[PDB]
Design an enzyme around this catalytic site. Structure first.
Site, PDB file in Angstrom:
ATOM      1  N   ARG E 355       0.806  -1.213   0.000  1.00 20.37           N
ATOM      2  CA  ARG E 355       0.000   0.000   0.000  1.00 20.37           C
ATOM      3  C   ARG E 355       0.842   1.268   0.000  1.00 20.37           C
ATOM      4  NH1 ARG E 355      -5.393  -1.399   3.690  1.00 20.37           N
ATOM      5  NH2 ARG E 355      -5.430  -3.630   3.178  1.00 20.37           N
TER       6      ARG E 355
HETATM    7  N1  LIG Z   1      -7.810   3.708  -7.673  1.00 20.47           N
HETATM    8  C1  LIG Z   1      -6.891   2.757  -7.481  1.00 20.47           C
HETATM    9  N2  LIG Z   1      -6.019   2.493  -8.477  1.00 20.47           N
HETATM   10  C2  LIG Z   1      -5.097   1.544  -8.292  1.00 20.47           C
HETATM   11  N3  LIG Z   1      -4.893   0.774  -7.220  1.00 20.47           N
HETATM   12  C3  LIG Z   1      -5.768   1.057  -6.250  1.00 20.47           C
HETATM   13  C4  LIG Z   1      -6.774   2.008  -6.294  1.00 20.47           C
HETATM   14  N4  LIG Z   1      -7.487   2.022  -5.105  1.00 20.47           N
HETATM   15  C5  LIG Z   1      -6.905   1.098  -4.382  1.00 20.47           C
HETATM   16  N5  LIG Z   1      -5.857   0.474  -5.010  1.00 20.47           N
HETATM   17  C6  LIG Z   1      -5.018  -0.588  -4.465  1.00 20.47           C
HETATM   18  O1  LIG Z   1      -5.344  -0.750  -3.097  1.00 20.47           O
HETATM   19  C7  LIG Z   1      -4.300  -0.191  -2.266  1.00 20.47           C
HETATM   20  C8  LIG Z   1      -4.914   0.715  -1.229  1.00 20.47           C
HETATM   21  O2  LIG Z   1      -5.903  -0.023  -0.482  1.00 20.47           O
HETATM   22  P1  LIG Z   1      -6.989   0.698   0.468  1.00 20.47           P
HETATM   23  O3  LIG Z   1      -7.605   1.867  -0.189  1.00 20.47           O
HETATM   24  O4  LIG Z   1      -6.282   1.001   1.790  1.00 20.47           O
HETATM   25  O5  LIG Z   1      -8.070  -0.430   0.769  1.00 20.47           O
HETATM   26  P2  LIG Z   1      -8.804  -0.884   2.111  1.00 20.47           P
HETATM   27  O6  LIG Z   1      -8.868   0.240   3.087  1.00 20.47           O
HETATM   28  O7  LIG Z   1     -10.178  -1.376   1.648  1.00 20.47           O
HETATM   29  O8  LIG Z   1      -7.986  -2.079   2.611  1.00 20.47           O
HETATM   30  C9  LIG Z   1      -3.325   0.494  -3.222  1.00 20.47           C
HETATM   31  O9  LIG Z   1      -1.988   0.394  -2.742  1.00 20.47           O
HETATM   32  C10 LIG Z   1      -3.519  -0.292  -4.518  1.00 20.47           C
HETATM   33  O10 LIG Z   1      -2.773  -1.505  -4.516  1.00 20.47           O
HETATM   34 MG   LIG Z   2      -8.197   1.452   4.531  1.00 20.53          MG
END
Ligand SMILES: Nc1ncnc2c1ncn2[C@@H]1O[C@H](COP(=O)(O)OP(=O)(O)O)[C@@H](O)[C@H]1O
Ligand SMILES: [Mg+2]
Ligand SMILES: Nc1ncnc2c1ncn2[C@@H]1O[C@H](COP(=O)(O)OP(=O)(O)OP(=O)(O)O)[C@@H](O)[C@H]1O
Ligand SMILES: Nc1ncnc2c1ncn2[C@@H]1O[C@H](COP(=O)(O)OP(=O)(O)OP(=O)(O)O)[C@@H](O)[C@H]1O
Ligand SMILES: [Mg+2]
Ligand SMILES: [Mg+2]
Lengths: 200, 166, 365, 487, 523, 46
Positions: E355
């Site tokens: 992330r």
């Molecule tokens: N718009 C996007 N484009 C590309 N990858 C994305 C996007 N949104 C999320 N990701 C992927 O998810 C990761 C971020 O996850 P996150 O938003 O924290 O999800 P959650 O909070 O549901 O676990 C990024 O590092 C990437 O791998």
């Molecule tokens: Mg999150």
């Protein structure tokens, strides 16, 4: 309950005597007497004071006569606090309670250090601890001083066992002469290792 | 003069003169990093001057520590320091920083790194100190006479089944 | 020296299954201490207890090694002055023993030089070995995909009637008979007939020379035994192997069948001890019990112990806590699948789910 | 026993984060706040919140800090009321915790009023009907599940599907130009994520330290004990309620993650003497969440647009917590891991999303018709996929094969690069207008772009970007053909 | 002038590795979560931790050492302080217990500190090179990051983390100690032999000088296994709060939860899911929140966490596994099928994610990683649904991801660049590793006498930092980089591939097979 | 289909059994930890 009842009359030593009689009587009662106990039928308890006898019946009704010792200790703590007495426990080895002269001095020194117990009267209570073979320990109001020591024939090694001689393969300098003799030098190293393992 | 502020808006100490003096009094250049560590802990981020002093200590220091450290290289430490300064601190190295690197390359006899640093100074800075460029060429031609232009084992002819893959 | 609690007298206060509470007036002895019931009670055999918990300064909970039949409250118990000790040395070779170390072969007295406690501390870090070599078993699947390591730990995970016992016998025939060192067979919660068959086999092969020197010791606590015995026979058998490793510097083979019954036995007593069960219903101390037992099964700088342990997978569920926790305690893992056996393939090893630690070019060719 | 301010009690039991307090004069009212005045050599103050009454004198409580160095019989003093949090415009641009204490190290905050975190939810008569579309600049949301102003929005998703990213995009698109104020509540999430949000907001001038800020942050994160994570949401909600009622402003309320509020209560439920319930959650799961959710609503005085992120454990939408939250929302956005694994972002499953304002009366007829046609085509494309797996694409009839080609373009055209995920994607984001999205999809459905290459719809904005990407694709293809021709 | 302790009561009951205490009437009392000493002898004490404080006054104690010596009725003294353990540079290269006691081989830090505040952190922008191309490219790791390593038993979870620690040895020897990466390896519930093997392995590469081991073997009580991660991170927080960077590895949190479950159940705590205690998420949550990247104002130090987690039959739907995944900033999923298929490390890129993103990558790696990511994405889809360029290079990238030891940054980045720019299009997939080995460990241009480059040669290891500063796609390095690759490709194809494709003899065929397999385990 | 149905059925029964055991286990712990105070009744009244 015992402390409150005794406070009304103003006499607390009667309860202590009752516990002493109970302890003496229990030494002769059969094993596990607290589970078939009937204090009314027991003649030893007939001489106890009304507060103590009432409490014993109270425990017998709930089947908690096994807590007689703990109830007594809690009461003795209340009486000492009310009478402003500080008890110092002197833990000594079994049979080593003969000499407690140093224990009293240590107890007095601890008493002086404690400001809360300035007005309290010092008392010494000896306890036998089998964990200490020599010396003594003193406990007063949670302050514990240890001046005691405790206890300080297997087969150590195999004389027959011998560590094998760890061989090391001889390493030759990397020159042209080594490359020409690589096979011959390797044979010598193998022979050397074989000699080391077998001995000669 | 003008108060600096950190990422979150809090101010940072800018009086970094005493630390530079401490850096200029070290014996082994590894001790210089400790001073930089202390500066960061004290919220006194190093400036361009501090990094140049650290490079000077590296060039002028005998060794990394009192006891030798295997595979220690002055050039690697200075380049890493420059990488930290430019990337993780947003400070452009000046001519002085690159001159120290070139001097170390000339001093250590590494004539191939000098060529790369020579182009870097000719690209970012304005040329290279002609004294150091000539010194590097002299070292390179000494290797040609002595034959130490490349490690020898590389020049050895090999084959499909004549290579020992460890 | 002599224990300060030997001869201490206690009285039975509570009896539930194989769990018995004993009250000592002078103080409960140390945990793991052994006690003997003195009252006749009309029993056909003696009654021995092992302390496992302290309820208070005077009361202690214990597990009985024999059946608790005809056991009444207030029954008199005497401390033995120490933990359960078993014979050790060459006198035990060629003999059959039980959890208590009593010979059950109906032969002459053991006459051991000394006895040692079953419970002991495991070797420390500085006493660990660093020798890796291949033990050739003669079986194609094992020698190829999951080669075994001399002095290492091997596990045979399998269901019911899959071939765990057969492979062990094959390994015994192909290794133990032609083995310079000693061997110890620990039967734990297994068929009693199998022990008899093994004993006859070892005599015919003359690994047990009744009139000469033998190389094998048998220790058996079987299914018929109560849970208390099945939870300690492994300790006693392991203790004998430890003497040879440490006090004789001799290579030892340790064939345990089945290790799962050990955990099962501890689960049964734990339920009676009044402990909150973990997942499935096992005791919360499942991992700790295996760790203490397995860590003792290792090769030190003095000697080597090559251990082969049979693991029973209940309901063919390999995710059960018992077998699952045992994977981390094994150098070599051999998983058997029922479906493979039903296809006529014996052994039923599932190579994909098997593993070995010496599968390294630095060790094997 | 009316005014319990300053009432004294003694700690009687301490097990984990649950502490029992004994008062000789009677336990104060539930939800009351208590301070541990005893000097226990702690580096942080200890405060407790009463949750239960064991008897007329004993009360069970949850601590807001770690219970380390806590002894029995320790003295405790009531604060005379529930936990109070500062409110007003003076809190703008500031970071707070569950107790309402600033943690930004930016000096004292001038508070003119404080409000309890526990309040009664609005009644039926205090409900306002606001049916207005909210333009988030996202093709998928604006089309299939349009959001409503003053309503409730849920982002149901697993771990790593993009719940946090979407919230950041919504903030960048809706909060920068918002007329009113914003409140962000971090609940049991990563601390670093809060730090990144704070930096971004300062850069975007939402939080203007020298000028005037227009947002508040309230953070209770994973490191905090369960007691804090079970009340941080109430604290932030209380701030939003004050802005709604007293200030009469339209406020945004972002919450991430609301599930942690349920999770924290479950952790403490066991120690409160409550028998567990299905999937090990507390029996009071539905009621506790309902009280909080009902407070998050738009009344006749003001409006609260709420966006809440819901974590679906192991992508099990049948789990109690995710399911219980579906009935308390006006617009649900369900994210699927499979969509993300295929390179489609945002990984929204339109077949599982829903919106209350998806009615012709509220939105334009064209918008309603286009959305329904897209959903039907996607549904049909799934059935044709199964036949493709068994028979092969060629075997499909011509009409079905056209639905396949058009549907695939729809799937890729729903993807959109966000302005906040440039690092993840490496490309600039796009902001698609509502009208552009409707027109672009409408033309696609009727085949106006049947000849456009399929990949031209992948990770782009409006129709114009599609044409530009198709032109670029044609140019590079021509160059490759020229290179091959020379060979 | 006496060493007066604080007696608080006696030992009432003992159940395995936990105990209960009854307080003596009229005593000061003990504080929650504090350390106590059970006097097993007038001179010997056993360590215990307070866990419960009941209404009856009884105290729940988690024993830590000398358990066999504990008996009912023994005295207990209260230190009145939390757990503090030795911390400093003097512990490196040593094996210690969670209590700080050193384990023979053949400053005090508090274990219950709070995590850094929100304003006390900074964005992750410094990379932490694991040494593996797959991770460093597709799964960036930055200092101050928590990267889970989830997989099945016997999949390389331990090997990859150990390799990451080893990969820092060479870097630390060259750069200043300021940027050196210290290592805290925590073994939990593992075999004692494995710890010894790991200790020897680290010693062989000289990693002990920058690494320390904290071991709580299986034979040890659950209490030590329960405190090992907190003690290990505490030793790593010493460097974080002093402008230095550290890497904490936990092997593994799965067994820590079991120990915590064992302790809670024995002490009469209500069970939860799978019998685990209700507050099991909060256990790991506060453990991993302590790993951060401190802001410039606090020193700039960091702690990087690599917790390891085991699954059953590739089931990531378990309880503790899900909790840890929801905490860390990224996950490396090691797949059993890939491991048995020859792919090692068996990193499942589809199921793995970071992330932090490209922010945790060096400027040189950003360009290569970004373009590489697109090619693989297409390659996965093309095969799932024709020698197109993405499909030609995608296979070679996969082949290059097979490794046995960590790779130097210069060697790895150069090889990826070559495969990215089509230099390996003419090279067969089977021969990619052999091509890489010649590129790194020998020089074909010098050997055949056609090398005209001035400085850019693969034997000049000092070029790694120049590459890491300017990028490969820069005029200073780009011109010579292409020339070297062009020469290497031409020489390799002409002199090696032609002969390799002309082998038919069984002896020659077998010899070639051994060579290529060896090249996999060499580069 | 027959095989999947068999495993589907074995799971549903186990899920019901597992969940109930879990809930019962947490009910037993509270029962075991239940504390009975002194019966403050008139024992002489009988
Ligand atoms: N718009 C996007 N484009 C590309 N990858 C994305 C996007 N949104 C999320 N990701 C992927 O998810 C990761 C971020 O996850 P996150 O938003 O924290 O999800 P959650 O909070 O549901 O676990 C990024 O590092 C990437 O791998
Ligand atoms: Mg999150
Ligand atoms: N190698 C083999 N070759 C042929 N048949 C075999 C083999 N191994 C096992 N079998 C068959 O399987 C049966 C059961 O084998 P075995 O006695 O080893 O079971 P097990 O794994 O010990 O199971 P359990 O002890 O729980 O009954 C044997 O009686 C035999 O019929
Ligand atoms: N990159 C690799 N290439 C080849 N073999 C590898 C690689 N990584 C690990 N191995 C080997 O795979 C086996 C398992 O590795 P490792 O010990 O790291 O597994 P693990 O995840 O720790 O499993 P467990 O601890 O449960 O045994 C070992 O034999 C190891 O040498
Ligand atoms: Mg069998
Ligand atoms: Mg491992």
């Amino acid at each position: 309950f015992l402390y409150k009842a005794a406070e009304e009359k103003g006499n607390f030593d009667n309860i202590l005597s009752d516990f002493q009689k109970i302890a003496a009587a229990a030494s002769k009662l059969p094993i596990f007497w607290e589970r078939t106990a009937v204090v009314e039928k027991i003649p030893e308890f007939k001489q106890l004071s009304e507060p103590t006898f009432f409490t014993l019946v109270w425990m017998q009704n709930n089947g908690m006569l096994e807590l007689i010792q703990e109830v007594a200790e809690v009461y003795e703590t209340f009486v000492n606090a009310k009478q402003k007495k500080a008890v110092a426990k002197i833990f000594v080895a079994p049979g080593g309670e003969k000499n407690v002269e140093e224990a009293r001095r240590v107890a007095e020194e601890l008493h002086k250090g404690l400001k809360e117990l300035a007005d309290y009267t010092l008392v010494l209570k000896t306890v036998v601890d089998r964990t200490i073979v020599k010396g003594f320990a003193v406990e007063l109001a949670g302050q514990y001083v240890n001046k005691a020591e405790g206890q300080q024939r297997a087969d150590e090694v195999d004389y027959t066992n011998l560590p094998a001689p760890k061989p090391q393969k001889t390493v030759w300098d990397d020159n042209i002469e080594t490359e020409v003799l690589r096979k011959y030098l390797d044979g010598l190293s193998q022979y050397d290792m074989e000699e080391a393992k077998y001995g000669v | 003069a003008a108060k600096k502020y950190d990422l979150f808006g809090y101010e940072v100490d800018t009086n970094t003169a005493p630390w530079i003096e401490k850096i200029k009094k070290c014996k082994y250049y590894d001790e210089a990093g400790e001073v930089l560590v202390n500066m960061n802990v004290s919220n006194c981020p190093p400036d361009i001057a501090t990094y140049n002093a650290t490079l000077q200590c590296i060039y002028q220091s005998p060794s990394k520590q009192s006891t030798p450290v295997d595979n220690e290289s002055k050039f690697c430490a200075m380049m890493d320091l420059l990488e930290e300064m430019q990337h993780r601190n947003r400070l452009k190295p000046n001519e002085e920083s690159w001159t120290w690197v070139m001097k170390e390359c000339v001093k250590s006899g590494q004539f191939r790194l000098g060529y790369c640093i020579q182009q870097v100074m000719e690209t970012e800075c304005k040329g290279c100190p002609a004294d150091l460029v000539k010194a590097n060429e002299a070292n390179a031609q000494k290797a040609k006479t002595e034959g130490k232009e490349h490690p020898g084992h590389l020049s050895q002819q090999a084959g499909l089944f004549d290579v020992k893959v460890e | 020296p002599v224990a300060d609690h030997k001869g201490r007298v206690g009285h039975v206060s509570q009896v539930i299954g194989a769990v018995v509470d004993v009250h000592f007036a002078d103080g409960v002895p140390p945990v793991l201490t052994a006690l003997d019931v003195v009252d006749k009670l009309g029993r056909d055999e003696p009654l021995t207890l092992e302390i496992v918990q302290h309820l208070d300064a005077h009361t202690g909970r214990c597990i009985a090694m024999q059946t608790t039949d005809l056991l009444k409250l207030k029954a008199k118990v005497v401390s033995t002055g120490g933990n359960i000790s078993v014979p050790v040395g060459r006198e035990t070779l060629g003999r059959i023993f039980n959890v208590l170390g009593d010979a059950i072969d109906q032969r002459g007295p053991v006459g051991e030089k000394l006895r040692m406690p079953i419970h002991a501390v495991a070797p420390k870090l500085a006493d660990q070995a660093a020798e890796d070599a291949v033990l050739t078993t003669g079986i194609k699947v094992i020698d190829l995909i999951l080669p075994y390591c001399k002095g290492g730990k091997i596990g045979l995970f399998g269901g019911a009637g899959v071939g765990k016992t057969v492979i062990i016998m094959e390994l015994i025939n192909n290794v133990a008979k032609g083995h310079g060192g000693f061997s110890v067979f620990a039967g734990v919660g297994e068929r009693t007939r199998e022990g008899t068959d093994l004993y006859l086999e070892m005599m015919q092969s003359k690994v047990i020379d009744l009139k000469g020197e033998s190389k094998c010791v048998l220790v058996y606590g079987q299914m018929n035994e109560p849970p208390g015995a099945r939870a300690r026979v492994a300790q006693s058998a392991l203790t004998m192997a430890e003497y040879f490793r440490d006090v004789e510097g001799q290579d030892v083979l340790l064939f345990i069948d089945n290790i799962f019954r050990f955990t099962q036995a501890n689960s049964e007593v734990s339920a009676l001890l009044g402990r909150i069960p973990a997942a499935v219903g096992y005791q919360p101390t499942l991992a700790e019990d295996l760790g203490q037992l397995q860590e003792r099964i290792t090769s030190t700088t003095k000697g080597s112990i090559t251990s082969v342990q049979a693991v029973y997978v209940p309901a063919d569920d390999i995710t059960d806590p018992a077998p699952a926790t045992t994977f981390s305690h094994l150098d070599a893992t051999t998983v058997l699948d029922r479906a493979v056996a039903e296809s006529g393939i014996y052994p039923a090893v599932n190579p994909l789910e098997c593993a070995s630690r010496i599968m390294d070019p630095d060790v094997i060719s | 026993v009316a005014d319990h301010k300053g009432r004294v009690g003694h700690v009687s039991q301490v097990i984990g984060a649950v502490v029992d307090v004994h008062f000789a004069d009677g336990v104060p009212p539930v939800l009351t706040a208590l301070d541990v005045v005893d000097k226990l050599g702690r580096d942080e103050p200890l405060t407790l919140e009463i949750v239960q009454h064991l008897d007329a004198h004993t009360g069970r409580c949850i601590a807001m800090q770690t219970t380390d160095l806590l002894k029995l019989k320790a003295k405790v003093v009531s604060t005379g009321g529930n936990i109070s949090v500062p409110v007003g415009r003076e809190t703008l641009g500031r970071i707070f915790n569950v107790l309402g204490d600033a943690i930004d190290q930016r000096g004292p905050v001038g508070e003119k009023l404080r409000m309890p975190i526990h309040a009664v939810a609005p009644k039926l008569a205090d409900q306002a009907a606001e049916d207005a579309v909210l333009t988030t600049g996202i093709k998928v949301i604006d089309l299939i599940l349009p959001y409503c102003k003053g309503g409730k929005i849920g982002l149901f998703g697993g771990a790593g599907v993009g719940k946090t990213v979407i919230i950041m995009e919504l903030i960048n698109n809706v909060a920068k130009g918002h007329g009113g104020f914003s409140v962000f509540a971090g609940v049991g999430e990563r601390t670093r994520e809060g730090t990144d949000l704070y930096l971004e907001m300062m850069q975007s001038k939402v939080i203007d330290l020298k000028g005037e800020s227009k947002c508040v942050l309230v953070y209770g994160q994973m490191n905090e004990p369960p007691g804090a994570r079970a009340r941080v949401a109430q604290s932030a909600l209380t701030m939003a309620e004050y802005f709604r009622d007293v200030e009469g402003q339209d406020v945004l309320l972002f919450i991430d993650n609301i599930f942690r509020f349920t999770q924290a209560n479950s952790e403490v439920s066991a120690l409160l003497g409550r028998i567990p319930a299905a999937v090990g959650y507390q029996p009071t799961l539905a009621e506790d969440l309902g009280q909080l959710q009902e407070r998050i609503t738009s009344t006749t005085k003001g409006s609260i647009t709420s966006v809440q992120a819901v974590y679906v454990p192991a992508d099990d939408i049948t789990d109690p917590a995710p399911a219980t939250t579906f009935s308390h929302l006006d617009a649900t956005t369900v994210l699927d891991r499979a969509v993300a694994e295929s390179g489609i972002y945002p990984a929204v499953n339109p077949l599982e999303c829903a919106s209350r304002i998806m009615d012709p009366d509220v939105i334009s007829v064209d918008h309603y018709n286009v959305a329904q046609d897209v959903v039907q085509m996607l549904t049909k494309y799934r059935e044709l996929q199964d036949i493709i797996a068994v028979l092969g694409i060629d075997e499909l009839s011509e009409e079905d094969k056209l639905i396949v080609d058009r549907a695939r373009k729809l799937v890729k055209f729903l993807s959109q690069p966000f302005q906040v995920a440039e690092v993840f994607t490496g490309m600039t984001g796009h902001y698609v207008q509502l009208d552009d999205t409707i027109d672009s999809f409408s033309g696609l459905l009727m085949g106006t772009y049947d000849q456009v290459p399929e990949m031209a719809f992948y990770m782009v904005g409006g129709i114009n970007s599609v044409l530009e990407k198709a032109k670029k694709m044609a140019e590079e293809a021509a160059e490759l053909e020229k290179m091959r021709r020379a060979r | 002038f006496f060493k007066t302790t604080e007696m608080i009561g006696y030992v009432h009951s003992i159940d395995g590795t936990i105990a209960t205490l009854i307080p003596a009437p009229g005593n000061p009392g003990v504080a929650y979560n504090t350390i106590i000493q059970i006097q097993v002898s007038p001179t010997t004490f056993a360590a215990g931790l307070v866990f419960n404080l009941e209404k009856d006054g009884r105290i729940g104690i988690i024993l830590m050492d000398n358990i066999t010596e504990v008996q009912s009725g023994q005295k207990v003294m209260a230190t009145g302080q939390l757990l503090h353990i030795p911390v400093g540079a003097g512990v490196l290269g040593k094996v210690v217990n969670p209590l700080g006691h050193e384990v023979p081989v053949g400053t005090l830090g508090k274990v219950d500190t709070g995590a850094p505040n929100i304003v006390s952190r900074s964005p992750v922008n410094y990379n932490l090179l694991t040494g593996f191309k797959a991770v460093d490219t597709m799964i960036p790791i930055g200092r101050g990051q928590r990267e889970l390593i989830v997989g099945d038993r016997q999949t390389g979870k331990t090997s990859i983390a150990v390799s990451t620690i080893i990969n820092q040895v060479r870097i630390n020897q060259q750069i200043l100690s300021k940027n050196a990466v210290i290592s805290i390896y925590v073994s939990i519930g593992q075999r004692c032999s494995n710890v010894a093997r790991i200790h020897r392995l680290l010693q062989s590469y000289g990693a002990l000088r920058y690494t320390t081991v904290m071991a709580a073997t299986a034979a040890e009580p659950a209490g030590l296994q329960y405190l090992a991660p907190y003690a290990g991170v505490t030793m790593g927080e010493y460097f974080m709060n002093r402008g230095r960077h550290c890497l904490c590895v936990y092997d593994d949190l799965s067994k820590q939860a079991v120990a915590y479950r064992q302790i809670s159940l024995l002490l009469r705590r209500p069970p939860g899911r799978e019998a685990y205690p209700g507050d099991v998420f909060y256990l790991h949550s506060r453990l991993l929140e302590r790993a951060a990247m401190l802001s410039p104002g606090k020193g700039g130090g960091s702690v990087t966490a690599l917790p390891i987690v085991e699954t059953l039959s590739n089931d990531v739907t378990a309880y503790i596994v899900t909790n840890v995944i929801s905490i860390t900033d990224g996950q490396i999923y090691l797949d059993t099928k890939l491991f048995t298929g020859g792919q090692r490390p068996a990193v499942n890129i589809g199921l793995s994610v970071s992330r932090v993103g490209s922010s945790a990558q060096n400027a040189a790696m950003k360009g290569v990683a970004g373009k590489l990511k697109g090619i693989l994405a297409e390659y996965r889809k093309l095969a799932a649904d024709v020698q197109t360029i993405p499909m030609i290079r995608g296979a070679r990238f996969v082949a290059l991801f097979n490794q046995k030891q960590p790779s130097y940054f210069m060697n790895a980045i150069v090889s990826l660049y070559a495969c990215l720019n089509g230099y390996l299009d003419d090279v067969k997939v089977q021969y990619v590793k052999f091509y890489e080995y010649l590129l790194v460990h020998r020089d074909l241009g010098i050997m055949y006498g056609t090398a005209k480059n001035k400085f850019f040669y693969m034997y000049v290891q000092e070029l790694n930092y120049l590459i890491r500063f300017f990028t490969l796609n820069s005029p200073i390095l780009h011109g010579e980089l292409e020339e070297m690759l062009k020469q290497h490709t031409h020489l390799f194809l002409q002199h090696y591939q032609s002969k390799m494709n002309a082998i038919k003899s069984e002896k020659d065929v077998k010899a070639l097979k051994n060579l290529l397999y060896s090249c996999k385990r060499a580069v | 289909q027959q095989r999947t149905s068999s495993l589907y059925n074995k799971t549903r029964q186990f899920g019901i059994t597992a969940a109930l055991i879990e809930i019962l286990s947490a009910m037993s712990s509270l029962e075991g930890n239940a504390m009975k105070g002194v019966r403050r009744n008139k024992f002489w009244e009988g």
